[PDB]
Amino acid sequence: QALLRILKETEFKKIKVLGSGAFGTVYKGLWIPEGEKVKIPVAIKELREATSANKEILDEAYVMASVDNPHVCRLLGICLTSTVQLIMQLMPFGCLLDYVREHKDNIGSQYLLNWCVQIAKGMNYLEDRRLVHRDLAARNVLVKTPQHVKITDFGLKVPIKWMALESILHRIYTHQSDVWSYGVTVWELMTFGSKPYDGIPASEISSILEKGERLPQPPICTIDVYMIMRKCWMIDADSRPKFRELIIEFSKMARDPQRYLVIQ
Numbered sequence: 517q518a519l520l521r522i523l524k525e526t527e528f529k530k531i532k533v534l535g536s537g538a539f540g541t542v543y544k545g546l547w548i549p550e551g552e553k554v555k556i557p558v559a560i561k562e563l564r565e566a567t568s569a570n571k572e573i574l575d576e577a578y579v580m581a582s583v584d585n586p587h588v589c590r591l592l593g594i595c596l597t598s599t600v601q602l603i604m605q606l607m608p609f610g611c612l613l614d615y616v617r618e619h620k621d622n623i624g625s626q627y628l629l630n631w632c633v634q635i636a637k638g639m640n641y642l643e644d645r646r647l648v649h650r651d652l653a654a655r656n657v658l659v660k661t662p663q664h665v666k667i668t669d670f671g672l673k674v675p676i677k678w679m680a681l682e683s684i685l686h687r688i689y690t691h692q693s694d695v696w697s698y699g700v701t702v703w704e705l706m707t708f709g710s711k712p713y714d715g716i717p718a719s720e721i722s723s724i725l726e727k728g729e730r731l732p733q734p735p736i737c738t739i740d741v742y743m744i745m746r747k748c749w750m751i752d753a754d755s756r757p758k759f760r761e762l763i764i765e766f767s768k769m770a771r772d773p774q775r776y777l778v779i780q
């Protein structure tokens with residue numbers, strides 16, 4: 517439908533690099549829609565050129581453009597050339613992982629718990645849309661303003677350290693495996709961006725989980741918060757919390773944040 521703009525190459529301009537990796541490159545730039553009198557700051561993700569589908573691509577992009585939730589990034593436009601370029605609003609404070617690392621000495625309990633609520637709200641919305649994210653992590657949450665974050669990079673180097681055991685062993689991905697990744701994401705935030713299982717080879721992680729070991733209790737977390745994170749990492753997928761429950765629980769904690777996180 518009319519939710520997704522097919523952009524002409526003249527309608528957007530790459531100005532600065534925001535970041536790059538094996539996926540491709542993201543640029544800060546401007547969207548200059550034809551016949552309008554406006555220049556809109558945007559991010560442009562240019563995927564690496566694929567050797568191998570235009571109808572199929574527009575079909576997936578149409579889904580990314582149809583999400584309508586304050587905590588889920590929405591695709592604004594696409595440009596199909598030798599490459600796929602995806603355009604969305606600029607999120608000026610960057611990814612939440614780097615934001616929490618850079619600002620750790622200045623982040624208090626209310627901020628942290630609000631982020632947990634907002635991420636759970638976005639994932640519950642994706643679940644309501646029958647969309648499984650498959651790569652939720654603090655690096656894939658973007659910061660529009662310090663207390664408005666949004667999930668990105670659904671619909672698009674396997675992220676073993678964020679994966680539910682059944683995803684590692686059987687390539688099963690469900691909303692309940694997303695809940696596992698949500699637990700890991702909360703752990704990243706509560707450790708001010710520490711690396712999960714730091715220094716442990718990816719291929720060792722399944723034996724850690726099989727033995728019953730989990731990521732450790734972050735110093736600032738009271739047992740009530742850590743218990744929620746542990747429940748996200750149950751082997752039985754159906755015994756993990758639902759995102760709806762996570763919203764309610766983190767919303768309750770956000771109402772009395774110093775009862776739940778202990779931050780010097």
Ligand SMILES: *CCC(=O)Nc1cc(-c2c[nH]c3ncnc(Nc4ccc5c(cnn5Cc5ccccc5)c4)c23)ccc1OCCO
Nearest residue numbers: 534535536542559561589590591602606607610611655669
């Ligand atoms: C945590 C490290 C990191 O990710 N660094 C990083 C940040 C950005 C970045 C900074 N400000 C931004 N504003 C808006 N978008 C992005 N990135 C981004 C992410 C996903 C995108 C983008 C365009 N299209 N997609 C996919 C998508 C869009 C909408 C819905 C679903 C999916 C733009 C941004 C950029 C690059 C960065 O580094 C990358 C390697 O670490």
